[PDB]
Design a protein around this nucleic acid. Sequence first.
DNA 1: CAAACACACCAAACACAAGAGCTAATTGACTGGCCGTTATCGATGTATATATCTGACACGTGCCTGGAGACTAGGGAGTAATCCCCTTGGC
Length: 50
Amino acid sequence: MTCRGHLMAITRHGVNRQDTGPLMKCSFEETVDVLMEAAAHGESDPMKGV
DNA sequence: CAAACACACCAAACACAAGAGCTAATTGACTGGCCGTTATCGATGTATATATCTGACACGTGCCTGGAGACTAGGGAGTAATCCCCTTGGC
């Protein structure tokens, strides 16, 4: 919770802000939203999360 | 006076609401126009059934011709005697 300096909330508003990966954010919450944002911005997933 | 940012407020959305597991029952589209098939109504017959009229056959009635009946008139056909002509017969 205190690795990025600011207090990341455990909610969708705090974990999805981290640059983990769209495939990991969509699992938790905000599926279509995070997927759409990644598609628009052309993000990349390193394929390292479980 | 006009533009910069900051704050408080108002107004507008997003996403979540544990893991699941079993069983039952309610919903099973619908008027209308139109084409395509087919059932029905209609004409245009030809075949068969029945009615009217004509033709041939049948039974019956009839008009007409010729035939038949009773009776009559009066004379044609016909007995009974006679003569003697003439035939058959003869030497």
